Amino acid sequence: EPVTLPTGRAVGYPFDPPPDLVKLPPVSPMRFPDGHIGWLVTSHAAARTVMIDPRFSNRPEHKHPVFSATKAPAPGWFINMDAPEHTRYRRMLISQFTVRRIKELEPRIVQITEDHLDAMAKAGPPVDLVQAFALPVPSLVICELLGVSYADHAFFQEQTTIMASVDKTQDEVTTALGKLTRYIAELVATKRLSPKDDLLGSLITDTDLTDEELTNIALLLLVAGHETTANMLGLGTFALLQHPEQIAALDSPDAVEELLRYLSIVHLGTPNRAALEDVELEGQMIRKGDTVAIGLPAVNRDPKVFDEPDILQLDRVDARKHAAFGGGIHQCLGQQLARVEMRIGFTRLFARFPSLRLAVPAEEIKLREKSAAYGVWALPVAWD
Numbered sequence: 001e002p003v004t005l006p007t008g009r010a011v012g013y014p015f016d017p018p019p020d021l022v023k024l025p026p027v028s029p030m031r032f033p034d035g036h037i038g039w040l041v042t043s044h045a046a047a048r049t050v051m052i053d054p055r056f057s058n059r060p061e062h063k064h065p066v067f068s069a070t071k072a073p074a075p076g077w078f079i080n081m082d083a084p085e086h087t088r089y090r091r092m093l094i095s096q097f098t099v100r101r102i103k104e105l106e107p108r109i110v111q112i113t114e115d116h117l118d119a120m121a122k123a124g125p126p127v128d129l130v131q132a133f134a135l136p137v138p139s140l141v142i143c144e145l146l147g148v149s150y151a152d153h154a155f156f157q158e159q160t161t162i163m164a165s166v167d168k169t170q171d172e173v174t175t176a177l178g179k180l181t182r183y184i185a186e187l188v189a190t191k192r193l194s195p196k197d198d199l200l201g202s203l204i205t206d207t208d209l210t211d212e213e214l215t216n217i218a219l220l221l222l223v224a225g226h227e228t229t230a231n232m233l234g235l236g237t238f239a240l241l242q243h244p245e246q247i248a249a250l251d252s253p254d255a256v257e258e259l260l261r262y263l264s265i266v267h268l269g270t271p272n273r274a275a276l277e278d279v280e281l282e283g284q285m286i287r288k289g290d291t292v293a294i295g296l297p298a299v300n301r302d303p304k305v306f307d308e309p310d311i312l313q314l315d316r317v318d319a320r321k322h323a324a325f326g327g328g329i330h331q332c333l334g335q336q337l338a339r340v341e342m343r344i345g346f347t348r349l350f351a352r353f354p355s356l357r358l359a360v361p362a363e364e365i366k367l368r369e370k371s372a373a374y375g376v377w378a379l380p381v382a383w384d
């Protein structure tokens with residue numbers, strides 16, 4: 001019988017998947033919000049198949065929305081494209097996201113992070129880590145990536161904070177997104193006049209990308225990279241405070257990978273894809289026109305892949321099989337930047353405040369249960 005997309009986390013188990021997801025067989029029929037009866041995939045093996053197989057399309061016309069569709073993806077909005085279209089954009093951006101090119105940003109990521117930790121030390125405790133650190137820091141990292149001027153930091157942060165914060169209406173969000181989008185078009189127009197060696201400057205120089213395509217690429221980087229990162233930083237801090245034996249393990253080489261696996265913040269039927277043909281999948285028959293959604297949090301706890309899947313274990317040997325970054329052609333472009341932001345962010349936070357603790361009971365922390373990026377709405381913390 002078709003299940004609805006599981007949304008309910010067990011009280012007192014904020015980091016673990018909904019029990020109604022973990023309970024399911026590998027491939028389940030799913031009733032979508034519009035009535036479509038598609039599929040939800042929960043095994044690591046079957047998920048991998050969906051992510052790498054070309055008979056699954058990410059074009060939005062073919063797809064039934066996962067919660068809450070017409071329209072070709074705007075030029076440059078390459079997440080929602082298939083090869084060969086996807087490939088053209090992806091090939092030009094590769095260069096900008098290696099270990100090597102991201103390394104150039106590290107010193108500024110460091111300073112941004114320390115700046116924010118300085119502001120927390122200066123205000124003294126208690127502080128909401130979400131607004132003081134987890135939201136702002138990754139937004140200012142994107143400002144650097146995109147080469148936003150310093151005079152425009154306050155504006156960029158304001159709109160980006162609105163989009164990502166609790167107690168904001170849908171109209172407020174939409175309004176902020178339009179301000180941000182207009183600002184990016186203007187930023188791209190300025191850089192066209194005098195291109196530098198930032199991501200956008202390099203692209204204007206080395207490629208035939210139009211203003212429109214650059215605008216959409218910059219926006220996509222913002223939208224895919226802000227809330228994701230912010231929420232790993234916030235929920236990850238939560239997890240570390242609730243499992244503090246792990247803090248001493250934070251320098252382990254795969255510690256950020258284990259946090260990515262355990263938390264699986266891209267948590268609600270994403271990635272999802274439209275079948276372009278009939279496809280057989282773990283003995284089920286997906287038909288042409290069916291939407292297939294992946295339940296990453298369960299993929300990342302698959303007992304055929306990971307030992308003791310439900311324990312947070314920063315020095316685990318098998319963290320790197322996780323799919324927290326997706327898979328296939330759309331596998332996260334910003335993966336290397338995220339990793340560095342998280343490493344730098346978790347490490348400096350705990351070095352500065354070895355005494356950090358939650359400033360309210362754990363039961364009081366509010367969770368982003370229906371949001372595309374799972375996390376906490378607020379994280380009051382204190383220190384000595």
Ligand code: HEM
Nearest residue numbers: 078079224225228229266271325326330332333334337338
């Ligand atoms: C600097 C931060 C980041 C940037 C700039 C960024 C950028 C992007 C972009 C452009 C894509 C689409 C790639 C394509 O279609 O070829 C993408 C995909 C994806 N990213 Fe990231 N990302 C960032 C951080 C994160 C974080 C922290 C996570 C999760 C922990 C995440 C998870 C994903 C996943 C699951 C996809 C695949 C979505 C799908 O297949 O439908 N990303 N990212």
